[PDB]
């Protein structure tokens, strides 16, 4: 196994309620260890580990660097959110909803964006709270998601199972019905 030395720099922006709270955290990382950090809430470089202390002290002593970092939350995070509002945040892809047996009944919700979604199981009109096991939200990497929500079922005559899906792309919820065959 050959040797490798890795350095990462992440200029990270955190948004809550649109632009109500905007926070910048730039992280300097040696291998997998964050060593220095500039948190806009804090206002100055902070050493995470001993390896980053000389860097944090030096950058903090430079007035022009501190001035640029303190404006970065506006010149980067706020500035770019305007571009996201016109691009990524307009993206709406409606989910595909299917039910199939696996005793487990699987409601499959695929190829949707954004990630915000609510899925619920119903049996003969009654919402099933227990026996509902759900996979984590699966990131496909192509700006779509999928999720699988299972229901522990007992095949009993004409039990009517219904998957109910709500998503920001849908004006009305999607309801898909499955009956045992």
């Amino acid at each position: 196994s050959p040797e490798d030395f890795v350095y990462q720099f992440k200029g990270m922006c955190y948004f809550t309620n649109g632009t109500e709270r905007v926070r910048l955290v730039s992280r300097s990382i040696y291998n997998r260890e964050e060593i220095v950090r500039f948190d806009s809430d804090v206002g100055e470089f902070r050493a995470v580990t001993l390896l980053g202390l000389p860097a944090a002290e030096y950058w903090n002593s430079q007035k022009d660097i501190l001035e640029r970092k303190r404006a970065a939350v506006d010149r980067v995070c706020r500035h770019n959110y305007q571009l996201e509002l016109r691009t990524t945040l307009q993206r709406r892809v409606e989910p595909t909803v299917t039910i199939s047996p696996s005793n487990l009944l699987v409601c499959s919700v695929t190829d949707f964006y954004p990630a915000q979604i609510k899925v619920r199981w119903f049996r003969n009109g009654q919402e099933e709270t227990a026996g509902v096991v759900s996979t984590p939200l699966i990131r496909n990497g192509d700006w779509t998601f999928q999720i699988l929500v299972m229901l522990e079922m007992t095949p009993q005559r004409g039990d009517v199972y219904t998957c109910h899906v709500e998503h920001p792309s849908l004006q009305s919820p999607i309801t898909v019905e499955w009956r045992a065959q």
Partner: T-cell receptor
Framework: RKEVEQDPGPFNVPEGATVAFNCTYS??????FFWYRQDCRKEPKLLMS???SGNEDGRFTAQLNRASQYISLLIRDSKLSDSATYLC?????????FGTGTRLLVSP | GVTQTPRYLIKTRGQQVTLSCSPI?????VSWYQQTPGQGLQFLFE???????NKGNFPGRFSGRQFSNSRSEMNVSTLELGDSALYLC????????????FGEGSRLTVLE
């Protein structure tokens, strides 16, 4: 040992004398250092920051030595109003530790 | 200046107490400390923009919150005689500052 250690027993100093406070910290990654002053049954008040070059402000001098991990506070020409408990305060990553302090009693 | 209410309190064992702290105008970080006789300052928690930022070693019955005006409250659920202390709040302009401005404290005595 404690993370921040200060001179224990009370300092009884005659008015006009110079007094030296000492403090040591264990975490070598500690980034910032401060001295606070606290009256009996009252709240702490920020006195000064500590710098390697030696922050000087009137009768007060605060110095840092990272090689030995020592923090010092010097008060020249002490007055009766200097009588208080002096807290050594050390800032590390997501940790701000207040020492238990060194009580100073200035005598006329 | 930092305002702390109430300044003095008497409570009986098993009761609950709520203390309030208004920071300096402009300051957005509020931290709570306990000063027990013969102990030294003990960190409870710090709040910045309504969310708890860091927390000390106190049990769950010690809780806090910060409102949208930066004002902060802390609560102790089931008081014990050993909880008697001076409870201090401190504010600063930015989060995780080593330069704190303390209020005058809420002096709480828990009684039989």
């Amino acid at each position: 040992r404690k993370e921040v250690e200060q001179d224990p027993g009370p300092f009884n100093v005659p008015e006009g004398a110079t007094v030296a406070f000492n403090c040591t910290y264990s975490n070598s990654a500690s980034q910032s250092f401060f001295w606070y002053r606290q009256d009996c049954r009252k709240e702490p008040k920020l006195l000064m920051s500590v710098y390697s070059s030696g922050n000087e402000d009137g009768r007060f001098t605060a110095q840092l030595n990272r090689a030995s991990q020592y923090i010092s506070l010097l008060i020249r020409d002490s007055k009766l109003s200097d009588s208080a408990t002096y807290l050594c305060v050390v800032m590390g990553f997501q940790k701000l530790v207040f020492g238990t302090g060194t009580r100073l009693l200035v005598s006329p | 200046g930092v305002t702390q209410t109430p300044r003095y309190l008497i409570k009986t064992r098993g009761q609950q107490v709520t203390l309030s702290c208004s920071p300096i105008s402009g300051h957005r970080s509020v931290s709570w400390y306990q000063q027990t006789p013969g102990q030294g300052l003990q960190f409870l928690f710090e709040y910045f923009s309504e969310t708890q930022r860091n927390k000390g070693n106190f049990p769950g019955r010690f809780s806090g919150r910060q409102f949208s005006n930066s004002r902060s409250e802390m609560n102790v659920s089931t008081l014990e005689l050993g909880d008697s202390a001076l409870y201090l709040c401190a504010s600063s302009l930015r989060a995780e500052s080593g330069e704190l401005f303390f209020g005058e404290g809420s002096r709480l005595t828990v009684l039989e």
